[PDB]
């Protein structure tokens, strides 16, 4: 069983979500207990499964939350919280923070078995028209508040035609008193 010459397939490298639930989230309420969370269906974030690469080597998926009003993705303000509890997931994720810039790095298997579902995190809304090391107190907020989950994996290699896909999608538009 190998790949000597079996011309009967049509699925190149591609990391598409297995399930995409509603795309909304009421991120504006959480001051009762101490730090509750907010997560809609499928723990807010949808499911993720990389399929399209039969390489026998583990790659690092580039997953993080960035804002986007047109296309130039940007680093969210404090949207980097995402602790998992209750259910136990064998997903091996990581958190990298370099000054107001957190990201997620999860090494997945391209040709073996590494399906994972992200539904155990939360967002932190504390805008105040002046994010600074002191405290954000004003009322609710007076600035856009959209978000965009970027799902793209890029492997380092010579032939650009190797493994590189982008999947930035997330219709989360905010508004006044919303």
Swiss-Prot record:
It is found in: Cytoplasm; Nucleus. The chain holds residues 416 to 591 of 943 of the full protein. Expressed in thymus, peripheral leukocytes as T-cells and spleen. Isoforms A are preferentially expressed in effector T-cells (thymus and peripheral leukocytes) whereas isoforms B and isoforms C are preferentially expressed in naive T-cells (spleen). Isoforms B are expressed in naive T-cells after first antigen exposure and isoforms A are expressed in effector T-cells after second antigen exposure. Isoforms IA are widely expressed but not detected in liver nor pancreas, neural expression is strongest in corpus callosum. Residues 26-33 bind DNA. This is Nuclear factor of activated T-cells, cytoplasmic 1. Plays a role in the inducible expression of cytokine genes in T-cells, especially in the induction of the IL-2 or IL-4 gene transcription. Also controls gene expression in embryonic cardiac cells. Could regulate not only the activation and proliferation but also the differentiation and programmed death of T-lymphocytes as well as lymphoid and non-lymphoid cells. Required for osteoclastogenesis and regulates many genes important for osteoclast differentiation and function. Induction: Only isoforms A are inducibly expressed in T lymphocytes upon activation of the T-cell receptor (TCR) complex. Induced after co-addition of phorbol 12-myristate 13-acetate (PMA) and ionomycin. Also induced after co-addition of 12-O-tetradecanoylphorbol-13-acetate (TPA) and ionomycin. Weakly induced with PMA, ionomycin and cyclosporin A. Phosphorylated by NFATC-kinase and GSK3B; phosphorylation induces NFATC1 nuclear exit and dephosphorylation by calcineurin promotes nuclear import. Phosphorylation by PKA and DYRK2 negatively modulates nuclear accumulation, and promotes subsequent phosphorylation by GSK3B or casein kinase 1.
């Amino acid at each position: 069983m190998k790949d000597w010459q079996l011309p009967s397939h049509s699925g190149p490298y591609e990391l598409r979500i297995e399930v995409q639930p509603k795309s909304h989230h009421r991120a504006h309420y959480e001051t009762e207990g101490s730090r509750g969370a907010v997560k809609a269906s499928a723990g807010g974030h949808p499911i993720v499964q990389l399929h399209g690469y039969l390489e026998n080597e583990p790659l690092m998926l580039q997953l993080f939350i960035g804002t986007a009003d047109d296309r130039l993705l940007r680093p969210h303000a404090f949207y980097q919280v995402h602790r998992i509890t209750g259910k136990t997931v064998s997903t091996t994720s990581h958190e990298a923070i370099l000054s107001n810039t957190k990201v997620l790095e999860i090494p997945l298997l391209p040709e073996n078995s590494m399906r994972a579902v992200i539904d155990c995190a939360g967002i932190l809304k504390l805008r105040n028209s002046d994010i600074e090391l002191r405290k954000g107190e004003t009322d609710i907020g007076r600035k856009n508040t959209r978000v965009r989950l970027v799902f793209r994996v890029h492997v380092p290699q010579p032939s650009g035609r190797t493994l590189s896909l982008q999947v930035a999608s997330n219709p989360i538009e905010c508004s006044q008193r919303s």
